[PDB]
Amino acid sequence: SECVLGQSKRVDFCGKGYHLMSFPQSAPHGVVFLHVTYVPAQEKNFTTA
Amino acid sequence: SECVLGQSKRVDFCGKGYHLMSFPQSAPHGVVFLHVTYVPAQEKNFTTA
Numbered sequence: 001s002e003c004v005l006g007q008s009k010r011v012d013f014c015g016k017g018y019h020l021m022s023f024p025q026s027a028p029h030g031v032v033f034l035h036v037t038y039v040p041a042q043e044k045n046f047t048t049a
Numbered sequence: 050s051e052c053v054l055g056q057s058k059r060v061d062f063c064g065k066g067y068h069l070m071s072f073p074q075s076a077p078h079g080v081v082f083l084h085v086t087y088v089p090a091q092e093k094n095f096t097t098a
Contacts, residue, residue, distance in 0.1 A: 011051055013051075
């Protein structure tokens with residue numbers, strides 16, 4: 001109800017990283033969720049005030 | 050996952066009042082959470098439109 005039919009703001013609920021969307025798949029006596037997540041890559045130093 | 054690694058918008062979940070942050074502490078066969086919360090103090094009447 002939460003990951004698929006909308007976007008979830010809960011941290012580390014709909015997969016690791018920031019959540020974008022999800023897709024369901026059936027399986028014998030179970031479900032498989034494919035989460036699509038957003039992750040920052042390359043950091044850079046800076047001076048702030 | 051929610052209170053510590055982020056800020057939770059759920060009401061009365063990460064302690065009473067508006068939530069700011071939390072800290073974990075170990076204990077024999079358990080955990081202890083220290084929640085830091087924000088509470089308004091002194092009310093004043095006003096007329097609104």
